Design a protein around this nucleic acid. Structure first.
Lengths: 62, 65, 64, 64, 65, 62
RNA sequence: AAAAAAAAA
RNA sequence: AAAAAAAAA
């Protein structure tokens, strides 16, 4: 109830995100969709990102 | 809880798309999704191995689905 | 519980926090919000930190 | 489920397995036993591996 | 589920024993257990910080309890 | 039901164990006790080891 | 398989 | 905060 609103707003407004993984890798793209356990990150492809592997989701614009 | 994960993985299984599965440690695994359940994925390549989802960071399809 | 009351006070009182992640990365900012699984850390931008990736939440100055 | 049937067949048929851990360490042995959370890996000794620490279970040779 | 963890940590809290808490990444934290719940521990030293148990590998008491 | 019997037998027979953590650190000592989430490892002190941080528990003797 | 880097925005 | 070492018994 902070998580859903946050990820939906980035999905609607189609804002570019950086997704930092727990290993330090930075992923860039857009939240295409998400569910309870994964985020679909669109860029050149739609990859499935497991939330358990994510540290942070950073908006490029507030 | 399943409504994005199962469709995603079943599409890649039914259509036999080559995947990269990156692990939380950075290792890249490649093959095809033989099958899966709530906790693991069968990745077939030269051998068919069992991959724990808790160890996966991303499933990247090679072709655009 | 002890987690909510703790993060709430760092919130209400707008205290600068360090959030150390399980990989060692320190994150500076202020707690804007939180729920069961995530914290919103406010600095240049409002980013969402997953709790499972956090090792510690350290106040920069003591709480009162 | 797919996990039980898979580890059971590597067991019954006494197939050598590699168990790769989340930190990269490869473990050679045979599955002696398992439950919901742990696997017993048989080599020099019967050690207990936690599943949460496992990234993959790889057969050394294909199953039939 | 609690029958070893809570006694262990409450003893260290009530008796104010200096602890080392080693994190899963190898970092050593030192202080005293101010309090705790199911998911976190308050470690008081120069400042009182909140430590997630999922990030802890071991709690080592300095004195033999 | 493979986990409890395994850890109890090491506790009774007082067998020395190596406990390898997910970071590769090796702990040595004896299972003093355990519960659902932690193991008490006796050596010079009794430390509490979180099971989520353990990769393997290796008996020194079968 | 480093009895363990108060911690690589 | 390495768009990512088929993988340091």
């Amino acid at each position: 109830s902070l998580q859903d609103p946050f990820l939906n707003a980035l999905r609607r407004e189609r804002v570019p995100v950086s997704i930092y993984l727990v290993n330090g890798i930075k992923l860039q793209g857009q939240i295409e969709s998400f569910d309870q356990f994964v985020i679909l990150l669109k860029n050149t492809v739609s990859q499935m990102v497991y939330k358990h592997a994510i540290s942070t989701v950073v908006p490029s614009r507030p």
